[PDB]
């Protein structure tokens with residue numbers, strides 16, 4: 001199943017091309033202004049077959065609870081109301097968000113003890129790297 005070294009609290013240390021990613025998602029100006037200032041905290045936890053990813057930032061908290069492979073509804077930090085699915089591939093937590101026909105993907109991999117999140121919308125590739133506290 002999902003490796004228990006995902007589990008824990010992560011804080012962002014590196015972000016590349018986040019603004020372009022928000023622009024691809026259609027985030028407005030006022031939200032873009034704030035999103036680039038945030039260095040969120042991500043807390044991954046496991047209760048049975050339910051996985052919970054909680055993102056904490058000064059501007060907004062978000063949380064999603066899900067079972068792998070089972071689709072759920074999600075309101076994103078930027079208030080997209082998506083139907084999303086999380087799957088396990090090759091040690092990669094892979095999330096796909098579906099809304100108004102568009103699609104974006106966030107892939108979370110462990111590398112050297114860090115959590116690297118790759119975010120893909122259209123042709124823009126945002127990479128966000130989290131260190132475990």
Ligand SMILES: CCCCCCCCCCCCCCCC(=O)O
Pocket residue numbers: 022025027031032034035038040042055057059060076077078106117119128
């Ligand atoms: C998530 C930062 C705080 C909230 C800022 C609101 C701007 C909307 C951002 C779009 C979704 C971001 C996806 C986060 C991926 C991750 O690093 O886990």
